[PDB]
Design a protein around this nucleic acid. Structure first.
Lengths: 98, 87, 96, 96, 79, 98
DNA sequence: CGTTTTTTTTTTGCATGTGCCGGTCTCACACGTGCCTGGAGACTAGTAAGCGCTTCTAGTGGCGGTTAAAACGCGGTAGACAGCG
DNA sequence: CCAAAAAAAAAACAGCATCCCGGTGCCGAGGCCGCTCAATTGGTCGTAGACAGCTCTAGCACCGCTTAAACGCACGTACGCGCTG
């Protein structure tokens, strides 16, 4: 059978998704996750469909930006594999992390 | 009053292949395991911090419905301003 | 003669004469404490403003101050503040 | 009927036909280009407000709108933004 | 020409408060180009406040607004 | 014939200098580097010695802060010697440079 | 098996920093005056928003089906990581 | 020279997926219309800020002396760095 080398399909996926702009979280789980969290402050809140799309645009971008910052810290420890220690770092410099 | 729905734990709804696609766009070629629940930690703190602020906006405006526009006055306040949902 | 430069120094001396009343303060620190007051002043009045301005209002009340203090101050700093503000207002109106 | 939502998108269509005639736009994109102007307005107007406030002045003139537009924009957008801003002022003051 | 005045033993002392033990000699160079870039940004804007007051003496209050502009608020001089 | 081991004095200088609050750049060589650059935007300028002081405070403080992050980026690379690529990285993530 | 080792604990001597006793000096906190302008007060005036009523947007929830995405396991490539010079 | 051999490489064939094509469909761009309200015109009135004048603060210049700091060099240690399993 046919078999690409580890990394090969990882490259094509990068190129494939960097190219596009469409959301890569499933909008339902997200909504439930947004609702679930929304409750903690006050229960029984209604959300415009733009409001849950507003958050899902904000979050997906922030994280794609975090994975850029994170991928450098990893290459900067001479590695290719991103890790916890990289997202912790990125956030620390960023000052999101005390 | 009250009606159908009380909370749940959608945290695990962030499929591994979902976080993987974010990182693939974020230029990442290889991803540790410890990654996917690490991200679930941060993403959760993000929304808590946005939605706290957005909920604070709705409560000023004495609505029960959170708008698109409540999210935006908060997201900007949290220096992450968004174009494509008014304001 | 001079300018006529308003500080907060007399008010910070009394809040010092109310918490650690033995310990005095250097003038470099007093300009810092001064700069501190004016910053959160400017932040709250700034957020309070934009709340009123997003809700089509021509007045900032107790209620827009409060909602600034919520967003701005984190966890337990906000709480004690909201209460000291609430108490301050309730204690004012009820006094005379 | 529905009550009014004032937007900058009629001017953005014209200015689009100015710069690229036969190029169109999407609703979303037009929503973005909307946000863009608001942000900037709020930025520029905001810095200018400070400039009046800092120099003990009541009225914002185009000199404050200039001193602002320098501070905020980068070098080569600032130069050009300062250009178009002096041009529109000299053509109005003459044309009037 | 006056750039250096920020001495190699001066940088050393900053980094030692920065919690640094061992410093490449390549860094003393690097630090100057960074520090220059920071003062440019801050000065430029700080004069922009002076030239709008129409003074020729730059004031503490001109730097304070320009740092506050750059995200860098400075408690201690006016405020 | 007494000597200390390459590092054990740096650590004494660290310990010491954090503990203190005095300006670790000499006041004249700075005051000139204030004037020198300032003449590039407008010539014939004066400065309130306080507004010189203002710039030293903010510039020393800035670099103090940057060294901390650059220190963190160099530890992250299995190092204790900081380098230029550890400044370059901590600014890139700080969003100061691209 | 009891020989070379490193080399891991042990005094060993050593140098700074931290005082805690002294002691002297200086200028900046601290507080006092005198006057001036910024907050107090009482009255007026106008409309912001608080309140009650209505409109009807749009936000919710449930179905049922299609099939795209989530999941899980196996296998081996390759990258992390330690060791060492 | 003529072996390795192993390593390192080149390309040859074979296979998989993405790119760009016309053929198809619909809905959102784009425009036109008719109407409401917000921008304009005109006039009035009150003061913001410009201007001239003067006061005098504080910023600039220089100077000579007393070290505190910078510089400089030297020696070797510990750490950066590659290579490998």
């Amino acid at each position: 059978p046919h078999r690409y080398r580890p990394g090969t399909v990882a490259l094509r996926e990068i190129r494939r998704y960097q190219k596009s702009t469409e959301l890569l979280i499933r909008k339902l789980p997200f909504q439930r996750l947004v609702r679930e969290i929304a409750q903690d402050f006050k229960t029984d809140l209604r959300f415009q469909s733009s409001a849950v799309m507003a958050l899902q645009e904000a979050c997906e971008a922030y994280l794609v930006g975090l994975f850029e910052d994170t991928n450098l810290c990893a290459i900067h420890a001479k590695r290719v594999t991103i890790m916890p220690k990289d997202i912790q770092l990125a956030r620390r410099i960023r000052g999101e992390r005390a | 009053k009250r009606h159908r729905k009380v909370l749940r734990d959608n945290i695990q709804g962030i499929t591994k292949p979902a976080i993987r696609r974010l990182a693939r766009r974020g230029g990442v070629k290889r991803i540790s395991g410890l990654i996917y629940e690490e991200t679930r930690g941060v993403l959760k703190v993000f929304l808590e911090n946005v939605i706290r602020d957005a909920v604070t906006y709705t409560e000023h405006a004495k609505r029960k419905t959170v708008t698109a526009m409540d999210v935006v006055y908060a997201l900007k306040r949290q220096g992450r301003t968004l174009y494509g949902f008014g304001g | 003669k001079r300018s006529r430069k308003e500080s907060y120094s007399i008010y910070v001396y009394k809040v010092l004469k109310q918490v650690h009343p033995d310990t005095g303060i250097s003038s470099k620190a007093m300009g810092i404490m001064n700069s501190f007051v004016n910053d959160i002043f400017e932040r709250i009045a700034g957020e309070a403003s934009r709340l009123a301005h997003y809700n089509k209002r021509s007045t900032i009340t107790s209620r827009e101050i409060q909602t600034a203090v919520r967003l701005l101050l984190p966890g337990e700093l906000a709480k004690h503040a909201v209460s000291e503000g609430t108490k301050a207002v309730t204690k004012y109106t009820s006094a005379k």
